[PDB]
Nucleic acid binder design. Structure first.
Lengths: 132, 56, 224
RNA sequence: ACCGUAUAGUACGAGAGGAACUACGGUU
């Protein structure tokens, strides 16, 4: 994919449970696999910010529940390295559901997004309030 | 921009270092060092602290 | 006229560029095919300023502005600001704005006469916008979306809004913005017309995937 | 060992689609 432009240590593995950053109706997501990156650590597949991941909906509205959908990791607890050298870490781990095409709706994110991510998925960026 | 001032104490920050805090509403706080950040986390205000340049 | 291009393989031109009647901002790391899309029809007419905003290259979503002024997030570095002041004409005011609803480009939608803002914006900020852009500001929602700058492409000639916007809102918005408005899509079905294309009174740049019908509506409503 | 950019929306192709040499940035 396009260079993220920052160094990332994958915070999440398959099976990790994470917050769903949007108003799709899905509260929490389970990461099944990492698709838009490829399985990076492969034996225990790992995903981090900027990766596109396949997920299943653990918690949310019944319509959403158990749906298998694609998503993008917006934030993670484990730190990142900026070119400048500063490391950035977030409060929690979260992802936003995205479509097959690669769009968000792109109601809002709520919350800030990494510039690295916005660059990779412009449409998602096109709906971010702030990008850090 | 060429010169950087600590958004906390007010002292100059040596270039190539310091940390930047992201507010989430995209506000920015540039901290010269951990001590300042620690105080801020404390929820103290720099004006209150005598040692700070801002206060003095 | 109206042209098509891509930033890398992205059709969302509005995300990586900002176009007004007096200036054009483009992301710093674009390709020749992307830059040419503007250089080829703007020529030596108006300044084409390469830039980053807050260190990012999604300058189209990170800023908002028109011929008179440009609004940039607080996190805009002094280096980027100095570079902007130097490149853009003196008649345009560059002001930092402190709002956290979303990226400036999604919260604000404007032309040289009117501007729509996120409906939850505070009064102080709404006055600042009106002041710097020297425009009339109105809190609005396009087809329910609060991210007005993301669901509305506007020039002084016409405008394009979310494809589901009712005819009643279209009629009211036309009156409010003083330009013909039509619900439509860009880049083959996208309803995010605000991020999918950039446009001013004489040129419209959209993504390579914009269909024939979609490009027809564009050069027709923006009168190109 | 891989991804990305320039090459290039080019060669090739009715069209859909869609390379390379080389030079770069980065990841694992």
């Amino acid at each position: 994919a396009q260079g993220t432009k920052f160094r990332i240590s994958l915070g999440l593995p398959v099976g990790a449970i994470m917050n769903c950053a949007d108003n799709s109706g899905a509260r929490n997501l389970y990461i099944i696999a990492v698709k838009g990156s490829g399985s990076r650590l492969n034996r225990l597949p790992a995903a981090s910010l900027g990766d596109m991941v396949m997920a299943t909906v653990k918690k949310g509205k019944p319509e959403l529940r158990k749906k298998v959908m694609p998503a993008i990791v917006v934030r993670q607890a484990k730190s990142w390295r900026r070119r400048d050298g500063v490391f950035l870490y977030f409060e929690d781990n979260a992802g936003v559901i995205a479509n097959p095409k690669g769009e968000m709706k792109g109601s809002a994110i709520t919350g800030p997004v990494g510039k690295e991510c916005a660059d990779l998925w412009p449409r998602v960026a096109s709906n971010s309030g702030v990008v850090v | 921009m060429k010169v950087e001032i600590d958004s906390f104490s007010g002292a100059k920050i040596y270039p190539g270092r310091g940390t930047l805090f992201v507010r989430g509403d995209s506000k920015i706080f540039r901290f010269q060092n951990s001590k300042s950040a620690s105080l801020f986390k404390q929820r103290k205000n720099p004006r209150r602290i005598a040692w700070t340049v801002l206060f003095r | 006229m109206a042209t098509r291009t891509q930033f890398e393989n992205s059709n969302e031109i509005g995300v990586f560029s900002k176009l007004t009647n007096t200036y054009c901002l483009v992301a710093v790391g674009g390709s020749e095919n992307f830059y040419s899309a503007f250089e080829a029809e703007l020529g030596d007419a108006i300044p084409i300023v390469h830039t980053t905003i807050a260190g990012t290259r999604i300058i189209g979503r990170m800023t908002a502005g028109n011929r008179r002024g440009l609004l940039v997030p607080t996190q805009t570095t002094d280096q980027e600001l100095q570079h902007l002041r130097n490149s853009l004409p003196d008649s345009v005011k560059i002001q930092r704005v402190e709002e956290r609803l979303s990226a400036l480009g999604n919260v604000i939608c404007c032309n040289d006469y009117v501007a729509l803002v996120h409906p939850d914006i505070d009064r102080e900020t709404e006055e600042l916008i009106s002041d710097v852009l020297g425009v009339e500001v109105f809190r609005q929602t396009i087809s329910g979306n609060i991210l007005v700058g993301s669901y509305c492409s506007l020039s002084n000639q016409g405008g394009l809004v979310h494809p589901q916007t009712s005819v009643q809102d279209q009629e009211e918005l036309s009156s409010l913005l003083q330009v013909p408005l039509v619900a439509g899509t860009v880049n083959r079905g996208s309803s995010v017309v605000g991020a999918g294309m950039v446009v001013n009174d004489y040129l419209a740049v959209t993504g390579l995937d914009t269909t024939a019908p979609e490009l027809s509506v564009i050069e027709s409503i923006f009168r190109l």
